[PDB]
Design a protein around this ligand. Structure first.
Ligand SMILES: Nc1ncnc2c1ncn2[C@@H]1O[C@H](COP(=O)(O)OP(=O)(O)OP(=O)(O)O)[C@@H](O)[C@H]1O
Length: 241
């Protein structure tokens, strides 16, 4: 709420959301799966492969808000974005694909030259962090709608297994949204806007999370076993260093 969206990032973000949707639809296309009319997942049909003109208002809006929240949170991390080259919009090239790859909607997605990108490990860790943030946003929406966590998915009790912290999140959905956000940030880069991240911070948390009373536990022999003469020896195995 504190930060505000610059206009240029907006006039790029509408097409950012559009080509995120293009990513998703072509993921489906090369997976080979097709659209289905009826809102039934189990009936071997999928109501998501919808033309952008007939695309649900709520779904397009939900994508638009994830895009704005993603770019805004990226800015709020301390990352600052710069337009070094205006010529990206001129050099930007469509990949030629066979007509069979085009979906029934009639619009042809154009995935650009993402491969030329140079990627830094801080930037992948950052992309993972925003994937975590998107998962947190989704979990917050589910919780306020009333969904709770469960080991087994049940719509009647509104219990879902994916409502878990990102560290414990299943790798399937983790990579599933990781690739989408990776492509989003990748295209934001490819359009001539490079991002510059704040430097990584090193710190020692010391895993201090014990009770207030105890920070350490002291074990000892009984006082009656005190030795006052001689040579004595014992051993201490360290299971954890
Ligand atoms: N990894 C992903 N990348 C991009 N879009 C995704 C991804 N996973 C899901 N989506 C899309 O986002 C929306 C997810 O909402 P959905 O209807 O699946 O939620 P839900 O039924 O509340 O979920 P759940 O029952 O798993 O808690 C759908 O429009 C779906 O197509």
């Amino acid at each position: 709420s504190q930060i505000v969206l610059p206009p240029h990032l907006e006039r790029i973000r509408e097409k950012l959301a559009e080509n995120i949707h293009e990513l998703w639809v072509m993921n489906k296309i090369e997976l080979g799966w097709q659209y289905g009319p009826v809102r039934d997942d189990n009936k071997r049909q999928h109501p998501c492969l919808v033309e952008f003109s007939k695309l649900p208002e709520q779904e397009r809006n939900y994508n638009l808000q994830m895009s704005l929240e993603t770019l805004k949170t990226l800015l709020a991390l301390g990352c600052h974005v710069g337009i070094s080259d205006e010529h990206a919009e001129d050099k930007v090239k469509k990949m030629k694909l066979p007509k069979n790859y085009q979906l029934t909607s009639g619009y042809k997605p154009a995935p650009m030259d993402l491969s030329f990108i140079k990627l830094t490990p801080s930037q992948e860790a950052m992309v993972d962090k925003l994937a975590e943030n998107a998962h947190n946003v989704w979990a917050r929406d589910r919780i306020r709608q009333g969904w709770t966590y469960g080991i087994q998915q049940d719509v009647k009790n509104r219990r879902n297994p994916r409502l878990v912290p990102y560290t414990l999140l299943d790798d399937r959905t983790k990579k599933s949204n990781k690739d989408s956000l990776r492509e989003a940030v990748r295209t934001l880069l490819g359009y001539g806007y490079n991002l510059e991240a704040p430097d990584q911070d090193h710190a020692a948390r010391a895993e201090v999370c014990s009770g207030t009373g105890e920070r350490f536990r002291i074990f000892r022999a009984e006082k009656t076993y005190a030795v006052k003469a001689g040579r004595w020896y014992f051993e201490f195995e360290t299971v954890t260093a």
